[PDB]
Design a protein around this nucleic acid. Structure first.
Ligand SMILES: [Mg+2]
Ligand SMILES: [Zn+2]
Ligand SMILES: [Zn+2]
Lengths: 48, 137, 49, 39, 113, 32, 67, 133, 56, 394, 147, 263
RNA sequence: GCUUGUGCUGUCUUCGUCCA
């Protein structure tokens, strides 16, 4: 259990900068965040 | 009005031009020379009215092979357009709406009464016929 | 719709007849089992009351 | 109803186009049938 | 669902080099260059510039698949010259041509305005 | 006045440097 | 539904010429002449304005759902 | 160096279906009964009826990968207007003095009919045809 | 219905398209289908590094 | 339906949601890309993978035991392009030659000498196709009793994998027996044969991409002289049918043995009308130029035939329902627009217009009747054929 | 509208498509091999008439059994400054060189059908089984297997 | 050696002639101007209220296609190359639209002139939506009746047409060479006579027609290329041409740098 | 001191898709 599951998040670095998302899966640093407009889920490190 | 049983006893002209007695692009009409004279009793209002709703959408159906007309009559009911103008207040199981419907550039006169110009179900695309890269075979 | 069914199917009820002129569409018909049994009214057709 | 300006303009355009079509198409058809008759 | 990101056509990954050169040992003095995140725009320009050089005996390119943004070039030169030097000369020559073309266009635009 | 009211000889002077039955003018409300 | 911003084939901005087109048709110009006046030369752009159906006018006749 | 030389007069030019390829028939001025049928490229070497051509056949151009010729080097081809390279796919040892040689220049076909004396040396795998006008 | 023919696991279905740049014995497979389907590979000393990379 | 409907392929992971096939395997699968779907099965064991890769693989299935001939060939625009590129008057410059040579995976890095060396180096399309053919292949075919100089560029001769003459088309790279594919399969094995498919497809696809090929409305339009000839043929046939009608109505008709007077009359009228359509179509097909696109497709053998040209340009012909002319569904007539007891060709289902010219409403209805017959026949015979196949298999 | 159905094989960007001398690129490229066997001459006639109508600002009348002929449409198209049979000179997008063949080019009315690849794609490794037979269930929605 | 001659010049279109250049160079210039010249376009849309009859993604797509002024977009940075947190003034421009219908009758049109620039780079001429005149209303975005309001906040970013066609500065580039077909690069389809069945090119009077007795010249190459560049208003035509040349030069210099660094 | 939960109906009917 991480305190960041099912919470609104924003991406600050990389090719998806400034996109609003929701954290769905968080095992080891590679948070899985669904994107509000593109109907897809992408992996991303917690640093971003 | 005449039904199928009364049609067996009448003589119908196809067009009003048929009531009065060498181009390589114009279609050729029957001579009907077996009889010396003809006494028509009725005349068709327009020959294109023998088609239904789905076949009235086809442009130039008399230049097509008939199975392709049947295939288009089947497929035209699966095209995506605007089924009703109140789709926002309706709650249907499924519904598809096209962003930018366009009316066709080639239309038939029967499309006037089918409201196809007001609720069209397609778009005019610029089409080339070419073997470009082998990805359209 | 013509209720003849699937059993004992024959070409003759499914055929486009001469008397169909001006009353049912010669083109619109479903593909497959209901070919020729399901018909569609022509544009100027009517049904007696 | 309080119709919009664009809709009223389109209605006027439709009436004008219907009248123009009813004149021109009928005249062209008459010219074509008389030419086909005189041949 | 399976559509790749559109920025992958031109953004170079960190672990993917822009340019990979391997020799073609079948014939003497030939190399195979693999260009990443490029297409016909650079390939055709380089090919038809190189094809006019007297010391270049073979030059060609192919885009293997349109769904992947890369092309591969084959270049063969004379004994005296090395193919990489010919490629550098071609790049410099096209840059000079574009420079004088831009100068003349600016001159003519200023004249006509 | 219009092109019809023009004299036929002056109409002959209007030379491009006839309508056809199959080119309709577009509509928006149709009929039925 | 509403006039597209760009031509599908080439991308010329045609979304600023709908009201002028309706005005020109009101004045009595033919559709081809009206399209010529709006400087739409390629038939790809002429198709966009000539075949557009304005469905938003029908959608706006329903009462708003929020006030 | 060269294997055969002669001078021919064109009896017929048959264009046929093609726009760029013509079939010419010729007979040697010096030695009759030596016929020549040949397909040529019209655009780069047009020929008319009753023209005189100098046809030469050689197995080499000297005096494996092809390359554009440097201006400095020189070859037999510099003296002629039209040069082709083909393969011999049939050497017919027919009658007492009737020999037919069939060559194919990438699909452009040639048949040289003649006597054994002249065409004895044409039993090669590849041949160049050099034409001057 | 259940002995001479049955429904099976490890199978996929989708629309087919043409590809001029594929070999005769090749088939193009979508990435989602490749992620869904699997093959059980036995861990040996010839492939342990590649398999643990896959597991990571 | 047969064992070539299940073949083992090699996986290539690609974007987008479709399965992708080489176009030469669409014939054994009987598949096209207008909405078809196909299934995929993954083996789960080493033994099962070996069975798939050594027994069911696509190269091993090129030649079928049913007719001892290949089931896979060059098709569609590759066939059209290989016909267009191997014509006698096709020449290629050095730069395009270098590109096409680099496109060949099996090319050995040695550029062949050009067919013409002076004044300008030009290669032919036969050389570029011969690059894709493996060495050691010999093939020889004779068409119409042609000689070894091949004036019409027909026949075929390949020596050591090099084309000497002959336009490469359906008779050489199709699926028929004795062609190039069968020879390469027998001589070099399945792997080289599959590489031959890939090489030919890549070279021809590049050349066709940079050459182009289209079709338009003008390709179905015959000149005025041919249209006059076709009209004269159809009118003469109709006069002949009128004479036959008069003879049958005055008891002056010869009776075919084993058949009644009505049956003989119907057969003779049908034979006359069929000959009329064939003559008009032959005139139309002889009129066409070499640059005609429909003619190019028909001559390549990739799509279309003589009847398609005949119906598009000259005459659709006689419409048959159940092997006979249009019956009298009304009281002694076919439609209420004719009079009673009318045996003229137009009254009983002869379409004298072409598709380009346009059908009249009577012809339209008769043609629709014939098409409905076709659809019913297919959708009815399918179940009987399936049952027969199941009983044979069991 | 003539029974010519198909699926997208690939998509190309603006600069990769072939173009005409005035810069027009197609929205759609279809194969020539679809035409001769199916004999859909009405497709080509519709394309020609739609080209004329879009150039002149009219709607073409495509009612069956009329007096319209291909030659009248061709004369109208020729008077507008185009080739009378609908052909155009086109250029290769990759190289900028002219194509040796001319391309039939014009507007055609297409429609999008309800069958999309993302509503049909389906794979199963393992999953739910039937209670009675313990075999995979049927249907893509239920995560079923193939038969 | 290369020469440029300008035939017609305007803010939104230039018609020029290129001579003494290769065909590949002209085609690469055309492709670069079509797909690789960077502009500014709306990329992120935050919707605070939308009670119109149009879907949210419909309006977002329409907003993406609005051409914005991109004159100084060369000094801006790419969003993925900016080290800033979220969006800053050096990699984005913020626009805001707020529309509403007042009254219980009639309809209100929402135009692109209603977009107001709120923030962006300091003293750079980027961000404002393009307008033909001072009295022009712009592109029609939506229509509103009573009690319907639209309130959005848009973010404009820098990009190229390879990622999405909304970033393309050009609409259509006419391109043509050899009007009299002296190089025989095309083979003309005909019924009776090819000469009188094909319309003449618009540049046919710029070149001397071939003499009847002339023979085919196999040594000739395409030399003169005619092209017209039409822009959407986001950039001027000369700006598009110069930036296309600069983009091609930068790509070539990057190739040269990779080559030299390879050692 | 606080810890993340572990699955699915049946039977008919109709309308469709790709072959045939
Ligand atoms: Mg299919
Ligand atoms: Zn446009
Ligand atoms: Zn920033």
């Amino acid at each position: 259990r991480d305190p960041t599951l099912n919470k609104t998040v924003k991406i600050r670095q990389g090719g998806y900068k400034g996109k609003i998302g929701i954290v769905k899966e968080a095992n080891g640093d590679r948070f899985r965040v669904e994107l509000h407009n593109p109907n897809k889920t992408i992996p991303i490190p917690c640093s971003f | 009005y005449v039904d199928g049983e009364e049609e067996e006893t009448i003589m119908i002209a196809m067009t009003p031009e048929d009531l009065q007695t060498n181009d390589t692009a114009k279609r050729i009409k029957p001579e009907m020379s077996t009889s010396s004279h003809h006494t028509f009793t009725h005349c068709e209002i327009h020959p294109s009215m023998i088609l239904g709703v789905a076949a009235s959408i086809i442009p130039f159906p008399d230049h097509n092979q008939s199975p392709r007309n049947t295939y288009q009559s089947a497929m035209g009911k699966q095209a995506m357009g605007v089924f009703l103008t109140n789709y926002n207040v309706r709650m249907d199981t499924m519904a598809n709406i096209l962003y930018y419907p366009q009316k066709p550039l080639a239309k038939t006169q029967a499309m006037e009464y089918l409201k196809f110009r007001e609720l069209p179900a397609g778009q005019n695309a610029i089409v080339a016929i070419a073997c470009y890269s082998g990805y359209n075979q | 719709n013509t209720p003849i069914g699937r059993d004992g199917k024959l070409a003759k009820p499914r055929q486009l007849h001469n008397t169909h002129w001006g009353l049912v569409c010669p083109a619109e018909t479903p593909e497959g089992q209901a070919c020729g049994l399901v018909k569609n009214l022509s544009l100027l057709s009517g049904i007696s009351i | 109803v309080v119709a919009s300006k664009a809709s009223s303009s389109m209605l006027k355009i439709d009436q004008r186009n219907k009248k123009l079509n009813n004149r021109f198409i009928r005249k062209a058809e008459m010219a074509a049938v008389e030419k086909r008759k005189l041949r | 669902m399976n559509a790749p990101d559109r920025f992958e056509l031109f953004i170079l990954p960190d672990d993917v080099p822009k340019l990979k050169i391997t020799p073609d040992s079948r014939v003497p003095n030939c190399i195979i260059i693999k260009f990443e995140r490029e297409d016909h725009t650079l390939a055709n320009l380089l090919r038809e510039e190189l094809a006019l050089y007297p010391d270049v005996t073979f030059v060609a390119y192919k885009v293997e698949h349109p769904l992947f943004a890369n092309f591969v070039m084959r270049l063969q030169t004379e004994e005296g010259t090395r193919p990489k030097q010919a490629l550098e000369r071609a790049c410099a020559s096209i840059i000079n041509k574009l420079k004088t073309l831009d100068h003349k266009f600016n001159e003519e635009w200023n004249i006509k305005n | 006045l219009a092109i019809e009211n023009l004299h036929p000889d002056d109409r002959l002077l209007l030379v491009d440097p006839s309508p056809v039955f199959f080119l309709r003018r577009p509509q928006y409300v149709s009929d039925g | 539904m509403i006039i597209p911003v760009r031509c599908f084939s080439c991308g010329k901005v045609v979304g600023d010429k709908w009201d002028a087109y309706l005005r020109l048709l009101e004045e009595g110009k033919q559709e081809g002449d009206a399209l010529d006046e709006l400087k739409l030369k390629r038939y790809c752009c002429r198709r966009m304005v000539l075949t557009h159906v304005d469905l938003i006018e029908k959608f706006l006749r329903y009462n708003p759902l929020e006030k | 160096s060269a294997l055969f030389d002669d001078i021919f007069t064109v009896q017929t030019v048959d264009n046929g279906r093609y726009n760029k390829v013509s079939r010419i028939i010729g007979i040697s001025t010096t030695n009759s009964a030596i016929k020549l049928t040949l397909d040529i490229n019209n655009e780069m070497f047009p020929v008319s009826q009753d023209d005189s051509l100098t046809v030469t056949l050689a197995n080499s151009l000297s005096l494996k990968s092809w390359r554009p010729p440097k201006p400095t080097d020189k070859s037999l081809a510099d003296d002629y207007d039209y040069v082709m390279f083909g393969t011999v796919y049939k050497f017919e040892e027919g009658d007492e003095d009737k020999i037919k040689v069939y060559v194919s220049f990438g699909g452009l076909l040639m048949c040289l009919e003649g006597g054994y004396k002249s065409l004895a040396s044409l039993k090669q795998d590849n041949l160049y045809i050099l034409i001057r006008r | 219905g259940n002995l001479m023919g049955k429904r099976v696991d490890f199978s996929a279905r989708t629309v087919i398209s043409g590809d001029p740049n594929l070999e005769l014995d090749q088939v193009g497979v979508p990435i989602s289908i490749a992620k869904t389907l699997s093959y059980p590979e036995t861990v040996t000393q010839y492939n342990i590094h590649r398999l643990t990379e896959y597991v990571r | 339906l047969h064992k070539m409907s299940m073949m083992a392929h090699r996986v290539k992971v690609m974007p987008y949601s479709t399965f992708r096939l080489n176009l030469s395997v669409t014939s054994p699968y009987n598949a096209d890309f207008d909405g078809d779907e196909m299934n995929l099965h993954v083996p789960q064991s080493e033994e099962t993978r070996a069975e798939l890769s050594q027994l069911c693989a696509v190269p091993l299935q090129i030649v079928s035991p049913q007719s001892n001939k290949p089931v896979m060939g060059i098709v569609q625009d590759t066939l059209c392009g290989v016909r267009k590129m191997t014509l006698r008057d096709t020449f290629i410059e050095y730069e395009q030659v270098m590109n096409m040579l680099f496109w060949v995976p099996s090319w050995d890095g040695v550029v062949p000498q050009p067919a013409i060396l002076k004044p300008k180096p030009l290669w032919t399309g036969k050389q570029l196709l011969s690059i894709a053919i493996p060495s050691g292949i010999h093939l020889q075919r004779t068409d119409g009793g042609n000689s070894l100089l091949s004036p019409k560029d027909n026949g075929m001769l390949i020596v050591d994998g090099k084309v000497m003459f002959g336009v490469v088309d359906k008779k050489t790279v199709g699926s028929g027996g004795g062609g190039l594919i069968h020879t390469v399969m027998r001589e070099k094995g399945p792997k080289i044969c599959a590489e031959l498919f890939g090489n030919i497809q890549k070279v021809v696809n590049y050349w066709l991409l940079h050459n182009g090929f289209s079709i338009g409305i003008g390709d179905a339009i015959a000149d005025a002289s041919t249209m006059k000839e076709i009209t004269h043929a159809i009118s003469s046939a109709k006069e002949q049918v009128q004479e036959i009608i008069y003879k049958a109505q005055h008891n002056e008709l010869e009776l075919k043995p084993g058949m009644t007077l009505r049956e003989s009359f119907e057969g003779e009228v049908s034979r006359t009308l069929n000959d009329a359509r064939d003559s008009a179509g032959r005139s139309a097909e002889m009129n066409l130029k070499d640059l005609n696109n429909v003619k190019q497709m028909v001559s390549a053998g990739s799509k279309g035939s003589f009847i398609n040209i005949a119906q598009m340009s000259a005459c659709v012909g006689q419409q048959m329902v159940e092997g006979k002319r249009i019956a009298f569904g009304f009281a002694d007539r076919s439609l209420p627009h004719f009079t009673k007891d009318d045996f003229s060709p137009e009254s009983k289902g002869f379409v004298e217009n072409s598709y380009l010219r346009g059908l009249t409403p009577q012809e339209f209805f008769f043609h629709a009747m014939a098409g409905r017959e076709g659809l019913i026949d297919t959708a009815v015979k399918t179940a009987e054929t399936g049952y027969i196949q199941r009983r044979l298999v069991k | 509208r003539h029974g010519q159905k198909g699926t997208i094989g690939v998509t190309y960007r603006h600069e990769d498509m072939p173009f005409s001398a005035e810069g027009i690129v197609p929205d759609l490229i279809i194969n020539p091999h679809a035409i001769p066997s199916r004999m859909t001459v009405a497709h080509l006639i519709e394309c020609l008439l739609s080209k004329v109508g879009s150039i002149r600002g009219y709607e073409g009348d495509a009612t069956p059994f009329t007096d319209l002929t291909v030659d009248a449409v061709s004369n109208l198209l020729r008077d507008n400054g185009y080739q009378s049979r609908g052909f155009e000179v086109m250029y290769n997008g990759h190289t900028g060189k002219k194509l040796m063949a001319q391309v039939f080019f014009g507007p055609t009315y297409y429609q999008r059908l309800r069958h999309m690849v993302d509503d049909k794609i389906h794979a199963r490794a393992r999953g739910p089984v039937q209670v009675l037979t313990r075999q995979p269930v049927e249907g893509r929605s239920r995560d079923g297997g193939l038969r | 050696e290369p020469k440029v001659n300008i035939i017609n010049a305007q803010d939104d279109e230039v018609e020029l002639m290129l001579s003494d250049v290769n065909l590949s160079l002209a085609n690469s210039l055309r492709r670069t101007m079509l797909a690789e010249v960077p502009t500014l376009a709306i990329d992120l849309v935050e919707i605070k209220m939308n009670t119109s009859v149009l879907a949210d993604e419909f309006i977002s797509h329409r907003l993406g296609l609005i051409p914005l002024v991109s004159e100084d977009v060369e000094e801006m940075k790419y969003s993925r190359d900016c080290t800033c947190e979220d969006y800053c003034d050096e990699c984005s421009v913020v626009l805001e639209l707020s529309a509403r219908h007042e009254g219980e009758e009639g309809t209100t049109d929402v135009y692109s002139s209603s977009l107001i620039k709120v923030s962006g780079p300091g003293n750079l001429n980027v961000g404002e939506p393009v307008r033909r005149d001072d009295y022009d209303q712009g592109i029609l975005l939506c229509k509103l009746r009573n009690h319907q309001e639209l309130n959005i906040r848009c973010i404009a970013k820098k990009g190229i047409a390879k990622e999405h066609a909304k970033w393309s500065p050009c609409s259509a580039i006419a391109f043509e060479y050899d009007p009299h077909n002296k190089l025989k690069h095309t083979d003309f389809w005909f019924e009776v006579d090819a000469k009188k069945e094909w319309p003449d090119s618009k540049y046919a009077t710029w070149e001397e027609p071939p003499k009847p007795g002339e023979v085919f010249d196999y040594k000739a190459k395409p030399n003169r290329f005619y092209m017209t560049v039409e822009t959407t208003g986001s950039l001027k035509a000369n700006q598009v041409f110069s930036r296309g040349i600069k983009t091609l030069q930068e790509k070539l210099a990057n190739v040269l740098f990779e080559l030299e660094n390879s050692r």
